[PDB]
Each structure stands twice: as C-alpha cells, then as structure tokens.
C-alpha cells in the first residue's frame, strides 16, 4: 500500500469534467452542430430534429407531422436507459 506507491490526483477534477459535459449538452441542445465550427448559433430544437432528419434522407415533414410520438419515444428510451443503468451494472464493467 504505502511502500512508496503514491497515487497522484488527476488534473481535471470530476466537477470540471462534469462542467465540460454540461457545456457540451447545452451547446448541442441550444445550437446543435454549429458550436463546434465557430460561434454558437441558436436554433429551436424542433428545427434541429428536422435538419437531422434531412441528414438521413427522411423528408422533414415526417418530424413535424409526428413530433409528439418522437418526443414520447425519446423520453421512454431515456427512461429505459435509466433503468438499465440503475438495476444493472453489466456494461459498466468495461470501466471496472
């Protein structure tokens, strides 16, 4: 244990990496794909999802004409991923 084997602290603390991921999420939500290529450009979030549906070939009418179902599928998938991280620690073994 203490036979000369000193564990050094990291430079970025866990609060600093949490503020970094906070900044990344606020950037992707409020701007989208534009804050990594210069300044941050505000876009309402339904237009981010429409212009990300255009990026996969789906016409953007599918988003606006199904916005509530896409919202419900997204929120239910977030709930399922919270359940899979709260009741199971199998994929986190990659870190362990």
């Amino acid at each position: 244990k203490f036979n000369g084997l000193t564990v050094l602290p990291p430079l970025l603390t866990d609060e600093m990496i949490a503020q970094y991921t906070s900044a990344l999420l606020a950037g992707t939500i409020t701007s989208g794909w534009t804050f990594g290529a210069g300044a941050a450009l505000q876009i309402p979030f339904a237009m981010q999802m429409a212009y990300r549906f255009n990026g996969i070939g789906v016409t953007q009418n599918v988003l606006y004409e199904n916005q509530k179902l896409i919202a419900n599928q997204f929120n239910s998938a977030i709930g399922k991923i919270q359940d899979s991280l709260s009741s199971t620690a199998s994929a986190l073994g990659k870190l362990q």
């Binding site: 990291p10 603390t13 600093m16 950037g27 450009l41």
Partner: protein, 240 residues
C-alpha cells in the same frame, strides 16, 4: 479502535504489512501508520525567464515547514489568488501555477473557459451573414529514428572471453537485433504509407493563374538548391 482476540499480538493488512500492534507491557491496541513520506516537486518558470521557484510537497500537508494546502499537497513559495486563469503549469486537482505579476509565482484554480449563455427561444434562429477563411496547422509525427545496436559490441567491447560468456546465454543478441530491425523496417513503411499516395508525379504549370489565390509559400521554388518551399524551409529549421 480495533479489538484483538485475547491472545493476538499484532495485526496485518491485505498487503501483508503490519498495520496494527498490541502493546506487550499494557493491554492496549496501538496502530502503526508509516511516517509522512512523499515526493518533492519543483514548480518553475524558465531559467531563461526567472529564478523564482515554488516547491510542491506531494501527498502530505504542511506539517514540516505563502504556504498553502492543495489536494496535491502542501505548496510553499506560491501565492494563492482568488482569480482564475488559463492553466499554465499543472499541479493537480484543478490547480495550476503560473508566473504572473514584481513578478512572482501564483497558484490558482483552473479556468475551464469563458462563461457563455446561448439565447434560446421557440422562434429565434441565428443565421450568419458573413464568413472567414481560417487556415489551421496540424503537426503529426510519421517516422522515428532508425537505430540498430550491435549487442556484442555493446556488452563486450573488443573482448573474446566476454564474447564466449555471452555465447553461453543462447540467442538474446539475435532476438534484440531482430526486434530493432523490425522497428527500422516499420519506420520506412510509415513514410511510404503517408507520403507515397500517388504514383504519377504531378507538377504545376509555369503560368500560375489560380483565380486570385497565391500559392507561393507552399509550392517549391526551384531557385533554391533543395527544391522545397518556404514553409517547409521554415519547418526544417525549428526541429533540431
């Protein structure tokens, strides 16, 4: 606060180290913890800049003795500041040292960036009305210095008794020569992967009309003996 069985003399830990003892004279349980050792780090700016020096005492705090405690440890010679700057010399745990302004070494908390609040609305979009052509530099290493060490010349310099006693050890010498030869062949495979992409050697026409772009800095000027460009000729003089 441990509690031995009524015959046991001392204690161990997971690491088979004596972590606790019982006093032989009086029935009480002591606790062995080693004395506060740790590394000593010397935070400095350049000698080509100054000679003021701070000193980091890692993993221990200021028992020994501008003397302040960090999570990295005690820190003597530094001046704690309630501001927050870009990180210059890291110390540990979000604390960076820098030689600011009469000029003495400060030690502060690292600033992750300029704080910003992007406006957001149901109806607001920001379209750019102009632009800027940014030209950026990335520097990547491709190859490494090829090297072969003749192991018999290294271990036994002009000797024949030593050569025979080296022959007793089997085939270590050929194994090391073979590994360094594999490295030195990889170091030419790397440059043939990166540069030799294109088989036809192309060359630029002498009448250079490129719509207004000036490519003189990057295209080679054949008036030089070595037919390379201005930016390459600057780059070959900054790596020694």
């Amino acid at each position: 606060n441990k509690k031995f069985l009524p015959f046991q003399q001392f204690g161990r830990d997971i690491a088979d180290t004596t972590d606790a003892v019982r006093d032989p004279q009086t029935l009480e349980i002591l606790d062995i913890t080693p004395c506060s050792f740790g590394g000593v780090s010397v935070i400095t700016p350049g000698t080509n800049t100054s000679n003021q020096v701070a000193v980091l005492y890692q993993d221990v705090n200021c028992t020994e003795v501008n003397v302040f405690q960090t999570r990295a440890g005690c820190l003597i010679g530094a001046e704690h500041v309630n501001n927050s700057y870009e990180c210059d010399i890291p110390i540990g745990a979000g604390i960076c040292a820098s030689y600011q302004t009469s000029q003495s070494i400060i030690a502060y908390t690292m600033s992750l960036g300029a704080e910003n609040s992007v406006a957001y609305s149901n109806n607001s979009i920001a379209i750019p009305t102009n632009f800027t052509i940014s030209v950026t530099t990335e520097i990547l290493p491709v190859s490494m210095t090829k090297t072969s060490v003749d192991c018999t010349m290294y271990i036994c310099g002009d000797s024949t008794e030593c050569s025979n006693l080296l022959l007793q050890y089997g085939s270590f010498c050929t194994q090391l020569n073979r590994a360094l030869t594999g490295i030195a062949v990889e170091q030419d495979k790397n440059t043939q992967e990166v540069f030799a992409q294109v088989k036809q050697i192309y060359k630029t026409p002498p009448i250079k009309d490129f719509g207004g772009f000036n490519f003189s800095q990057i295209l080679p000027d054949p008036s030089k003996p070595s037919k390379r460009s201005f930016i390459e000729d600057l780059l070959f003089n900054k790596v020694t």
